[PDB]
Each structure stands twice: as structure tokens, then as C-alpha cells.
Amino acid sequence: RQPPEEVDVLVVGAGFSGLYALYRLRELGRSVHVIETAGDVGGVWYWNRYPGARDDIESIEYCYSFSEEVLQEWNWTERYASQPEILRYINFVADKFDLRSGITFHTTVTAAAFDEATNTWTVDTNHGDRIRARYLIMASGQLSVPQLPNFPGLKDFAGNLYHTGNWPHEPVDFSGQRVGVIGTGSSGIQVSPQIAKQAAELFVFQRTPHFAVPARNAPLDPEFLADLKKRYAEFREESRNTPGGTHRYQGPKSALEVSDEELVETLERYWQEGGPDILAAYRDILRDRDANERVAEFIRNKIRNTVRDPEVAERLVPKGYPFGTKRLILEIDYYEMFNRDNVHLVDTLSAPIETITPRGVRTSEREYELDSLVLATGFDALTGALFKIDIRGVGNVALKEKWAAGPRTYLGLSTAGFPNLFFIAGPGSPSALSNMLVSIEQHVEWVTDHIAYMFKNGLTRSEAVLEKEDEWVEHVNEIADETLYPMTASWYTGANVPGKPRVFMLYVGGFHRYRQICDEVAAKGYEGFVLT
Numbered sequence: 001r002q003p004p005e006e007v008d009v010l011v012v013g014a015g016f017s018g019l020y021a022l023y024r025l026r027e028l029g030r031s032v033h034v035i036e037t038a039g040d041v042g043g044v045w046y047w048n049r050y051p052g053a054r055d056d057i058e059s060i061e062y063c064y065s066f067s068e069e070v071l072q073e074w075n076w077t078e079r080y081a082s083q084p085e086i087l088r089y090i091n092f093v094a095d096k097f098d099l100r101s102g103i104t105f106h107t108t109v110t111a112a113a114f115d116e117a118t119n120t121w122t123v124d125t126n127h128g129d130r131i132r133a134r135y136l137i138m139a140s141g142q143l144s145v146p147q148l149p150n151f152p153g154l155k156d157f158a159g160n161l162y163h164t165g166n167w168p169h170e171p172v173d174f175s176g177q178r179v180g181v182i183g184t185g186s187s188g189i190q191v192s193p194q195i196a197k198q199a200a201e202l203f204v205f206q207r208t209p210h211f212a213v214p215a216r217n218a219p220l221d222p223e224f225l226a227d228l229k230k231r232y233a234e235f236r237e238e239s240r241n242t243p244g245g246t247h248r249y250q251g252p253k254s255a256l257e258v259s260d261e262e263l264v265e266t267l268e269r270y271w272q273e274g275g276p277d278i279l280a281a282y283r284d285i286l287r288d289r290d291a292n293e294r295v296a297e298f299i300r301n302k303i304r305n306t307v308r309d310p311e312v313a314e315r316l317v318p319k320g321y322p323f324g325t326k327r328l329i330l331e332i333d334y335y336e337m338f339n340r341d342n343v344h345l346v347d348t349l350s351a352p353i354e355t356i357t358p359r360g361v362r363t364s365e366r367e368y369e370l371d372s373l374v375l376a377t378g379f380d381a382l383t384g385a386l387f388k389i390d391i392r393g394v395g396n397v398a399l400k401e402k403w404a405a406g407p408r409t410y411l412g413l414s415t416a417g418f419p420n421l422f423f424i425a426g427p428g429s430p431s432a433l434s435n436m437l438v439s440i441e442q443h444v445e446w447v448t449d450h451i452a453y454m455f456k457n458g459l460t461r462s463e464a465v466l467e468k469e470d471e472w473v474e475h476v477n478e479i480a481d482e483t484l485y486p487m488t489a490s491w492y493t494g495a496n497v498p499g500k501p502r503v504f505m506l507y508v509g510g511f512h513r514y515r516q517i518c519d520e521v522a523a524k525g526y527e528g529f530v531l532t
């Protein structure tokens with residue numbers, strides 16, 4: 001399916017972001033087209049097909065709200081939707097609004113350069129397509145370029161090698177195998193108990209332990225769903241008016257004001273309920289080290305109590321960093337897993353990995369022989385997908401160079417020197433710090449509204465004002481630095497790609513507050529942009 005030679009707006013990516021941009025620009029009466037590397041729609045939910053892949057936000061929150069018909073018709077089945085169900089949802093949306101007619105699959109954007117003479121992007125692909133677009137929307141994701149761990153010998157490994165972010169499209173059979181998983185973030189935590197059910201022996205190679213709390217998944221009562229439907233739009237505006245984009249209770253107390261007994265009774269209640277709302281149990285968990293630590297110890301002790309062998313249990317306890325500052329994980333039978341005969345925790349802080357071998361993995365203490373190795377080693381987050389494209393602005397400035405010390409943006413939406421270019425739910429904005437469907441919807445609507453505004457007013461050039469970008473970047477940093485988030489090496493800071501600048505990339509002030517700023521900006525005719 002050939003892309004058009006010219007279009008008002010070209011969109012890279014057919015995940016949640018790109019698909020809604022396509023939908024909305026069509027409704028705004030703009031020509032629009034999508035380029036996507038994958039063979040079909042879904043983004044993250046197309047690529048991450050590993051067993052156990054699942055929502056970490058409730059199904060009823062992690063969904064599109066732009067269409068009443070979609071909200072009324074779709075029936076979610078569990079508290080936390082599995083990947084295949086999310087993928088059926090996305091397919092349902094794409095079918096309903098005939099989206100694929102606007103998408104070129106199997107195609108990768110390789111370069112894009114702005115032409116000051118015409119105020120347009122020329123965009124090239126790996127199939128040799130050249131498309132000329134007035135506006136360019138990068139809906140290319142946050143967690144979309146898989147990162148391999150940095151160990152030698154990977155290509156010498158004789159067995160089968162997988163990354164969770166590029167999982168095969170037909171079921172992988174691990175029956176009777178000695179299997180290793182490297183990585184114990186959300187992907188490792190989700191996949192490992194699934195593999196443990198097939199493998200003769202599973203070895204989990206943990207570096208820093210992450211905090212995880214129980215999901216307590218359950219079926220969704222159909223009468224609950226039917227009630228919610230009667231007030232769904234209302235329910236969703238409630239979620240938009242929050243820092244996190246969900247119904248999470250914002251606990252008004254300080255974790256330091258309470259007694260040890262009240263702290264325990266309160267956290268015990270969250271622990272039994274399950275899910276991520278414990279993050280907001282007390283207002284200062286992500287702001288005060290001593291407040292954080294009280295919560296952290298409570299979680300650490302629950303972890304100790306889950307695993308019988310206390311030497312194994314202790315190796316699972318997170319240390320060295322504040323609770324909640326690497327993204328919180330929901331676990332289903334992951335801690336319980338290590339009580340099984342056939343599951344072994346390899347502590348690689350104690351015994352670092354030296355090399356992959358043809359037979360398996362060598363640490364400083366011994367060699368582990370394996371038939372398959374699964375990398376749950378994450379992603380080159382936030383900037384990874386952009387940096388794979390040769391994006392050039394005014395004066396032939398490469399985006400990758402301009403951002404070599406960290407992403408530099410105004411509201412996260414655009415960067416000075418690169419006009420008519422917009423980034424969806426990326427650095428400098430709430431992004432993954434909120435329910436991403438709320439982050440995504442707000443960005444798509446703001447961008448596509450801004451674009452409609454340009455056409456309406458016969459303007460053809462939109463650019464962020466350098467001084468406002470610099471002030472935004474400093475603001476992002478200053479507000480991050482009032483939290484505990486910069487204290488820790490996470491993907492939010494880039495600290496998991498060797499050599500990437502260690503800088504907290506996201507806006508921490510909350511979705512609601514961010515959206516307010518955005519609306520004030522557009523209300524004043526896009527203050528901090530120069531439009532011509």
C-alpha cells in the first residue's frame with residue numbers, strides 16, 4: 001500500500017497514539033497518513049506478545065474515551081487486561097473507524113528533514129518512499145526500541161534467544177528446557193512465572209531487585225461494567241482531573257505524621273486490595289526520603305515473608321533506591337515462584353555476568369547451561385525511537401545532537417529549531433508518569449487542535465521559542481529535583497543505555513496540572529510558539 005507523495009500531516013507509529021491522531025485529523029478534515037514498521041496496528045501491544053504480558057492499570061482506565069460508541073460497546077473481562085485482549089480492543093477500534101486505509105505497514109521512517117523554503121518535512125523510508133508533509137507527528141512510542149544488555153557473547157549462544165519486546169507471533173514452547181531470563185522489571189516479572197510452568201529448570205538473573213506488589217487480578221463483574229457504562233464519560237473526566245490519570249486515592253496525610261501502627265494498618269489494606277494505589281497512600285512518599293523509607297520497609301518485609309528460604313528471600317529485597325522511583329511493578333505469583341524446586345534466583349550483583357557462552361551464561365562464580373535465553377532487558381526509552389531516525393531541523397541541526405545531553409523541549413510537544421514537529425507523550429511531558437491513554441489522548445487532541453488552528457488561520461509554520469524551551473527544561477528539572485525520582489538509575493533517567501545522559505526526562509507535576517498549562521498556552525494563541 002503506497003503512501004501519498006504529499007499530505008497535510010504525516011504520523012509515525014500505529015500504536016494507540018498514531019491511531020487516534022489519524023482518526024482525529026480525518027475528523028478535522030485534514031489529509032493524514034501513517035507509517036508503521038510493524039505488520040499491523042497496536043504498537044506495544046503488537047510487539048510485546050510474551051506470555052503473561054498484561055496492563056498494570058485497570059482495564060476500565062486503560063482505554064480510549066474519545067468515542068462513546070466504543071465505551072458502550074466494548075466489554076473488558078478482567079481487572080487487568082492481557083495483551084491479547086488489548087490487541088483485540090485495538091483491532092476493534094481500527095476496524096470501526098476504517099483506520100488501515102490511512103496506514104502503510106512494514107515500513108520504517110529513516111530520515112526526515114525540514115525545508116525552510118516551503119515550511120515542510122520531507123520524510124524518507126526504508127522502502128525508498130519520499131513523502132512531503134506540512135506537519136510531522138512522532139507517535140513512535142516511549143518503550144518501543146528494545147535494549148539488549150551489554151554483555152559479550154550473545155551471538156555465540158547456541159540455543160534460542162528472545163527479547164520480550166520482539167516476541168515471536170506463534171507460541172514458544174519451553175517444555176523440558178533449561179531457560180534463563182535476564183531482567184526483573186515488569187517484563188521479567190510477568191514472563192518468568194509463565195516460563196516456570198514449562199521449563200525443566202528456570203534461572204532468573206536479577207541485577208537490582210525491583211519493588212513489585214500483588215496485582216490481585218480478578219474477573220470483572222458484568223453488572224459492575226454495565227453500571228459504569230451509564231456514567232463512563234463522567235468517570236473518565238474524573239480520571240483526567242488527577243495527577244496520575246486514574247481513580248487512585250490521593251492520600252492526604254504525610255507518611256511521617258502517622259504512627260507505626262496506623263502506617264501498617266493502612267498499607268496492609270492496600271496490599272490486600274492489590275494494584276498500584278499504594279504509591280499515593282501518603283502525599284510525601286516520592287518527596288521525602290524518610291517518608292519513602294517507611295513504606296519501603298513495609299514492602300520489603302512482605303517480600304521476605306513470601307519466600308520460605310530466607311537467603312533467597314533476602315536476595316529479592318530491593319535496596320539502594322527509594323520506593324516508587326523505578327516504576328512500580330504488579331506481580332502475579334512471581335515471588336511465590338521462587339518457592340518451587342525448579343526455579344533459581346541468580347543474584348548478579350553478588351556474581352556479575354562476565355559473558356554469554358555457547359552453552360549459556362557465565363557469572364563470576366559459575367557457568368549456567370541453558371537451552372533458551374529470554375532477555376527482559378527493557379528499552380532504549382523515550383528518545384530511542386526518535387534517535388533511530390535522521391531528523392534534521394533548521395540549519396541542518398540533527399535532533400540526536402541537539403538532545404545529546406538530554407531531551408530539550410517546550411511542553412514536551414516540540415523543540416526549538418524543528419518547526420512543525422510534534423512528539424506524543426514523550427520527554428518533557430507527563431508521559432509514563434500517568435495512565436498513558438490519558439497522556440496520549442491529551443497530546444493528540446492538543447496537537448491536532450493546534451494544527452487545525454494553523455490551517456484555519458492560514459498559517460504554515462509553528463515553532464517553539466528557544467527561550468521558553470530553555471525555561472521549560474529548567475522547570476522540568478527543578479520540579480523533578482524536589483522529588484526522589486532523580487535519585488535512581490532507571491529508564492526514566494536513561495541510566496539503562498550505556499553512555500546515555502543520566503537526566504530525569506519526565507514532567508512530575510501531574511497530568512491535571514500539565515493539562516492546565518497546556519490549555520492556558522493554546523488559549524493565549526499558543527504562547528511560547530511563534531506562528532507564521
Ligand SMILES: Cc1cc2nc3c(=O)[nH]c(=O)nc-3n(C[C@H](O)[C@H](O)[C@H](O)COP(=O)(O)OP(=O)(O)OC[C@H]3O[C@@H](n4cnc5c(N)ncnc54)[C@H](O)[C@@H]3O)c2cc1C
Pocket residue numbers: 012013014015016017018035036037038042043044045046048053054055056057062107108109110139140141142143144385388389424425434435436437440
Ligand atoms: C509491555 C508494555 C506494557 C505496558 N503497559 C502499560 C500499562 O499497563 N499502562 C500504561 O499506562 N502504559 C503501559 N505501557 C506504556 C505504553 O508505552 C503506552 O501505554 C502506549 O501503549 C504507547 O503508545 P504509543 O502509540 O505512544 O507508542 P507504541 O505503542 O510504542 O507505538 C509506537 C509504534 O511506532 C512504531 N515506530 C517507531 N519508530 C518507527 C519508525 N521509524 N518507522 C515506522 N514506525 C515506527 C513502532 O513499531 C510502534 O508500533 C506499557 C508498555 C510496554 C512496553
Ligand SMILES: NC(=O)c1ccc[n+]([C@@H]2O[C@H](COP(=O)([O-])OP(=O)(O)OC[C@H]3O[C@@H](n4cnc5c(N)ncnc54)[C@H](OP(=O)(O)O)[C@@H]3O)[C@@H](O)[C@H]2O)c1
Pocket residue numbers: 053054055056057143148149150151182183184185186187188190206207208209327330376377378379432491496
Ligand atoms: N504493564 C505492565 O505490567 C508492563 C509490562 C512490561 C513493561 N511495562 C512497561 O515497560 C517498562 C519497561 O519494563 P521492562 O521490564 O521491559 O524494562 P526495565 O524496567 O527497563 O527492566 C530491565 C531489566 O533488565 C535488567 N537489565 C538491563 N540491562 C542489564 C544488564 N546489562 N545486565 C543485567 N541486567 C540488565 C535491569 O536490571 P537493573 O534494574 O539492575 O538495571 C532490569 O531488571 C516498564 O517499566 C513499564 O513502563 C509494563
